Symmetry: C5
Subunit: 376 residues, 5 copies
């Protein structure tokens, strides 16, 4: 993930211009190799046409170049790229929205599962660990970085996400499909045991716990679905064919013909086809947006930081359910204890942001005394 949110907080002069001076996650980094290949092919064709071809061969090549330049169209490519990239971006954000966060679940586990003794600690930690284990089980299934961190279940054991007993239990239950769903059954059964054992005081709290857990399960299932059901290969091939056919045609139709022939539009022979290179940057970068985002769990610069998410979730959830259980700051009257209309101060840098309340769009409507009188 490349974050530039702070750089575009305000619409300043050349706001998006400055973003052109970035390398990581940039268009240049993504398409420099393709551009080099295209440039080499273009100039190889130029040299062949200029030197190797004879007079009649050169005339044939010139006729071909005019014919090609006539057959270059940018409407269909723009249409297909726009629609396909819109789909890819929508799926990319949907895949982010299905990354599980244990925050709701950990708050419920910390509040509801009672006991400051070693049994209560163990129970809360085990429940939140089951949540985290399901999450990383799915993430290592779908993310190459997480997989490289945990290439086997024994790596999960060594990293503390799973205990040896849990690993043995998983081995016992082995089915010929992904076992990422098992920690949810474990969580449900352990929560039921906690309720029956008196650690959870009321069944409605148990229902809340299991509802949050099931929300996490639905998110992980959506992650699995996105990993499994790719965008149809035919659509991807169609957009790829459109782009690459356009630029294969450009390789010939954008050659600088010999000026002496004085063909229409070829009067001046510049060596560098600047507009064709700009079109390459535009269209191939538009395609590279999809190429990077189509699988957001790879290792691109703009792909999600799954390993950081795993680490943060583990730390935060364990802290929330273990150290923060029934550990509250002292409850004392606040600064506005007897202030009916609290007005927190503003700093010098923020005083300009003090605003009057918006009362509605009808507030300033003006009516006469006659207009405002109720009729019978």
């Amino acid at each position: 993930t490349i974050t530039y949110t702070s750089q575009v907080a305000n619409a300043r002069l050349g706001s998006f211009s400055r973003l052109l001076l970035c390398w990581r996650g940039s268009i240049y980094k993504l398409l420099y190799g393709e551009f080099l290949i295209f440039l080499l092919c273009y100039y190889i064709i130029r040299f062949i046409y200029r030197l190797a071809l004879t007079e009649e061969q050169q005339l044939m090549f010139e006729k071909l170049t005019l014919y090609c330049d006539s057959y270059i169209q940018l409407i269909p490519i723009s249409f297909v790229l726009g629609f396909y990239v819109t789909l890819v971006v929508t799926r990319w954000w949907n895949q982010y929205e299905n990354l599980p966060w244990p925050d709701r679940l950990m708050s419920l586990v910390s509040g509801f599962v009672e006991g400051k003794d070693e049994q209560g600690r163990l129970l809360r930690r085990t429940l939140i660990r089951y949540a985290n284990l399901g999450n990383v089980l799915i993430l290592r299934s779908v993310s190459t970085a997480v997989y490289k961190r945990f290439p086997s279940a024994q790596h999960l054991v060594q990293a503390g996400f799973m205990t040896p007993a849990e690993h043995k239990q998983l081995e016992k239950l082995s089915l010929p499909h992904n076992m990422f769903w098992v920690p949810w059954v474990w969580f449900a059964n352990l929560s039921m045991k906690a309720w029956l054992g008196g650690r959870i005081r009321d069944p409605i709290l148990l229902q809340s716990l299991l509802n949050e857990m099931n929300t996490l399960r639905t998110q992980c299932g959506h992650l699995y679905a996105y990993d499994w059901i790719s965008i149809p290969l035919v659509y991807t091939q169609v957009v790829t064919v459109a782009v690459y056919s356009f630029f294969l045609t450009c390789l010939v139709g954008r050659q600088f013909l010999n000026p002496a022939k004085a063909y229409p539009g070829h009067e001046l022979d510049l060596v560098v086809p600047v507009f064709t290179f700009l079109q390459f940057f535009f269209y191939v970068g538009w395609l590279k947006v999809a190429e990077q985002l189509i699988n957001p769990f790879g290792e691109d610069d703009d792909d999600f930081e799954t390993n950081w998410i795993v680490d943060r979730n583990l730390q935060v959830s364990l802290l929330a359910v273990d150290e923060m259980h029934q550990d509250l700051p002292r409850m004392e009257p606040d600064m506005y204890w007897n202030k009916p209309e609290p007005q927190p101060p503003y700093t010098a840098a923020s005083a300009q942001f003090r605003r009057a309340s918006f009362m509605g769009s009808t507030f300033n409507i003006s009516l006469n005394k006659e207009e405002m009188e109720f009729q019978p």
Copy 2:
């Protein structure tokens, strides 16, 4: 389903280029027959024009060819294809999202329905079997592969999805519509019996069970709706007419006229209309995306693997509710039992993915001492 997610994890050089070397689920496989027909017709027209037609007939055909090539437009076809294919893809993903998964339901059934005896096993298995039976009842209604697996209800009995008693009960209830809804009524009544019989301890657990079951019912109803309410036939015919009229026009307007006439744009007579073939690939593949996805429960390469889903759901749900009921791994203190800030290790291949936390876009804003002072 053709999965190429691992191949597009990163935006590598020619990432989408390599996908052009795939056959299953490919554009080539989908439109090779249509392309062969188009090619044969094009060259039949070419031979007729070149040999059969007389001088005046050839001049008439040339005038017709110019007139046709003038009347070929790619804006409306791109518009209609983009919108129609977007609709088809949206419905395709919506239909995936309505495939029922018993995972939430099976976790609840495993946790809440109590008893390790043969009655508890039977009750849990029967409930989850009712869920699975409703699912396959709808799937065999909407999926041709599942139907070919279970062409009759007796096949469901032979496959273990339904018992003979359940088959007799279904026959007793026969109405002149699809009976996929019956297992939900059965599930509700059996859950109520379990609660009244003491197997379910609290009515809120019963409400959770029935909420998950009703979610599954809503998904199955959406599957039925998508199977029943097709995209309006008029829209499909409109897009088909657009595409096929375009290429019928191309059959004449893209013929290579005799060079001796030296018509504008026909100076060089290549035999193969390469750009017209590229346009065929592009547009007809764009249409074939919709043709494949319009009914995602057929037998195309990219259609959903419904039979695998049925098998996996049966296995996983039965295991979850029967063997995993109150069968938990030993609960022991974890590796970070007294570690306030757990830091799971990284491998050599994944050390590069260790990241500092993103603290927010306002973290690095700089303010002077005067700026940060509160004003009265």
Copy 3:
């Protein structure tokens, strides 16, 4: 509703081509009258130009024809049609999604409302009948077919949807607005009475019943809203003006001028403007998609089968709550009672659909022994 889902299960050769041989719900049926009018006007103009007009008049008409043919543009029409038809289709599917189904409600009513005696039967049947009565009350408000079936409330009484006592009660409550909401208040009060009377055992079951009922109410309210708040008339008039202005212009700009004048592009005088007719089919059918779908509760071929839905809902709901109440198939051990890994068989026609499980996109990643070692 015209269902062709089975015909497009697979992307076969000419899959959408075969759909051009359909009449019901087809483009031909929808626009043949408009096409006949357009054809008659076109040829009337042709005959007037060819016979009535004098030499100078013919020259003026030819200049007008060139001027018109120059002023024909297909970009704005495609834009507006695409956006407007997308909106219409979105609203069409939203209106389908708000058709109420009593399946969740009937399952809850069958399970929760207890008693096999005549009072329990009457209570369950009355509750589900209130649901069905609200549904048909709204449907006859919004659907012309349902209205033609039930043109008055006395027709509802004669058809069994409402009792004479309910009709009298509705008459007593008459307000100067649609009374489709009354059965929901009746349902709520009757459910409360059932709970207070001991027929519903716990208030959480009552909350479930009323939640499902309120979901149905929200759907019916959305149906009312779609019936009431039409797509803004100005937008519809704008799209209509675009289409009809385009083809009014075509009536003159697409006339076949006299060849002897040898105008550019008019060298050959074919009598039938085939491309203009194809454009008519395309654009007017695109508009007819919206014309058919703008009100999906009319009597078009592709409009919803509301009467069938009403009948099916009544039959299914009454059967579910009355005959299926606490009437379960015998609960016996299933075929996989002691089979840890059930494998339901495949038929000969379906053996090809047996698939190996997809384990995730990271499954086949390869790492060396050094790469997989945890670092300190």
Copy 4:
């Protein structure tokens, strides 16, 4: 709101054509003034060019006219209008979806709050009145028609929406922001009092009441947000600039030059630029769609009928909670009491809508005896 749903029930001959004969909410009513201004300016320019300008001045004006007519483009205007109007229409429907309806809430209040005495009546009426008061408080904040009906809180008191005691309480709580949220706090506290006082029998019923109330609060907050957060002014100005620049250019580039000069495309001097007027109608009406819908709570013909909604909600909710409380029609066996397969009759006008059930797209698949045999 202009409702034409009944007029477009079926896709009849010239279905959208007849809608061109409507005045209220029409394109003509919306843009006749702008069209008159444009027409006057166009013909003023025509007269100036024809009479005032000298020969050299006329030649300069002709060169300018050709230059302008060359610089008129309809692609960007169509793009921006389509996207902007799509956004406006989406927000318009979202704003409708956030209009609060007390139907779910009034059903719950009627059912759950017990007591046929004057205290129960007062409690139910007060709760539903708090709901209605919150609704109109927000509506008069955002709707000009409702504001004109209730230009002050004393008008709310005189109209019966608020009591003098409630007005005094609101005055006591006055904060420098919109107070539309207060009735929700009142409702919550009154419901809690009713539960503690025994009028609400179980806390789960209280939770249902407050959930429905909070749904209404969320809708009212969304109404406030839409009133407050306008579509960014820059976007609106951009689309306005596009449209008006297009037609300012047309004012000169669409002038009829003197035929004697025989400029290309100006051979015939018709006085009325019919196509330019059609383009004006199309594009300016497309913009007027957004102009009307951008604030749907104004007083346009197609703006929402907020006053009717307020009146209907008050009447219906008071009737539902007061007169309909525990007032049910007599519960008697229905017409299909012992009819396992009820078949409500059809009228002569509706017999054509009797349909056979759709059994699924796989129903008619045919398989041989060999194909249907299970394999081991």
Copy 5:
């Protein structure tokens, strides 16, 4: 936020025209600097071409100018701008929808947490303060204005949002990530303590409180996600490159060549390229829409008023939970106590908005006596 809702209530003559006379949040304010730079560069190029260049150099520059003007295309730029700006606007509204409001939570806290003594006041105030503290913690993480108001946690203490004890507790829990989640764990634990202490009477009320709190947590997490996961930098760079390449090309291709050469389209040498400036305004303002909205928590005119939201939320929530707890207006019979059909009056200015109820689109259908007869 620039609100112009009241100005566009009705579609009046020149409704959007008047919005062109606005400065704050306007296109002019956003792009005047870029326009000045573009104008200066354009006229520098003009002067160089007119004075510095020699005859042959001027001819070369003229050929270059024709070549450039030929290579200027507005289809791809419009496509990419439309799609990208649509994405930006969608994310902008989504980010507004995730701004937390404590209204549902404060109503629940006021109702459910009992006790008019100093302990009950303290408990309610502390809970709602935890909600507000979580909100501002996230807002100061994502909003530059809020950060400038609270550049440190000690500023939060000085402003009354946090107590010194809470600050010490936060310091104790410090992890190397954003700690905005801590107040939710605090809230959950304090609510559990209140329930165990008898201040919350039933666990279902506790479940309601925690559900509302968790909704707020989900909103704050979405705010964090939008702050962290920027729109992919490659997409932004692509759109920026498209726009700036277009106008860099215009800098040369839109120069006014010397009339004496009488080049096609350059007959008249006006000094000001008015259409190019209009295109600049259009396209660069379209881009500036995204530039302003890409981060809606900056300090642009149209960015959200986060500081006002924070202040209003604090004031309203404290008032709701402290002063409004069990403080209700006197409950007395309303004005329509015995009025079965209440009709609140209309004013003279609003009498025109009195409407008859819409009874449904099928109300006015006419049928004969034969048509309405049920058939057997």
